Structure 1
């Protein structure tokens, strides 16, 4: 594993065997959907909405309690972002490293890490263009990449 490292950690979630769950959840699907929508109004990404719903509330899996997954819900309600969440966070990291590099020219493993992050950005963006989420000829051009993530 670890596309850009020699790590081999496994460390994931083990979601339950039950697809209908969990027999102590008395809340309604539409109630969870509206809580998802207002978190998306507050500018939370689907990962953050799912974390909040699991900790603060008893939402084990939004796709289980509701009918479908969180990014699908937000896209249904017009709350989809311009670029996917994971692509946004990779571009954000590349921008942060690049602004570290402009002030630290000797930081060569920062330069090495920036190459890894940008390689991860281009592979992801290539996927998203193939499944037609990003428009074709969408490109991370690395000079005005601060525009689309801030």
Structure 2
């Protein structure tokens, strides 16, 4: 079941059993690393880099060739995002909802959804502080969070 709902969704992707890249790829490991760094310069998240490689350049998985994960490559090159991508996308959604609530004070449905999203944020931040991906004494506040986001 979902963390904060009643839905039972099963939609997901299924990775193959055979991990070797196909013989028609003809793309070196160095070339893949260069293509990854170029897109990050353009300002794309690790999720969007993987889809762009998959859709256009025929690379099914960036781990089967070059033996490394996308976020690990970015960390080595020093171009990793300041805060984890999943945490950032949740903070952006909460900001948009609060802006809508400023003009509409009778939207009790949106107030309920804001409670759920903020609960998810605090659970996520607790995990990242434990594995030392965020600095200790890092907090999410509704007033400050309007900045540092799209």
TM-score (norm 2): 0.96
1:103 aligns with 2:114: no
Q: Specify the alignment match of 2:4 in structure 1.
A: 4
Q: Specify the alignment match of 1:126 in structure 2.
A: 126
Distance in 2 between residues matched to 1:11 and 1:53, nearest whole Å:
22
Question: Displacement, 1:29?
Answer: 1.0
Distance in 1 between residues matched to 2:81 and 2:15, nearest whole Å:
27
Unaligned 5+ runs, structure 1: none
Q: Specify the alignment match of 1:65 in structure 2.
A: 65
Distance in 1 between residues matched to 2:30 and 2:22, nearest whole Å:
17
Deviations 1:93-147 (A, max 9, x none): 0101111111111111111111111111111111111110000111111111022
Distance in 1 between residues matched to 2:65 and 2:57, nearest whole Å:
12
Q: Could you list the structure 1 runs, at least 4 aligned residues long, displaced by more than 4 angstroms after superposition.
A: none
Q: Specify the alignment match of 2:29 in structure 1.
A: 29
Q: Specify the alignment match of 1:39 in structure 2.
A: 39
TM-score (norm 1): 0.96
Question: Displacement, 1:20?
Answer: 2.0
Distance in 2 between residues matched to 1:4 and 1:79, nearest whole Å:
33
CA-based RMSD:
0.9
Equivalent pairs counted in the alignment come to: 150
Unaligned 5+ runs, structure 2: none
1:145 aligns with 2:148: no
Q: Specify the alignment match of 2:112 in structure 1.
A: 112
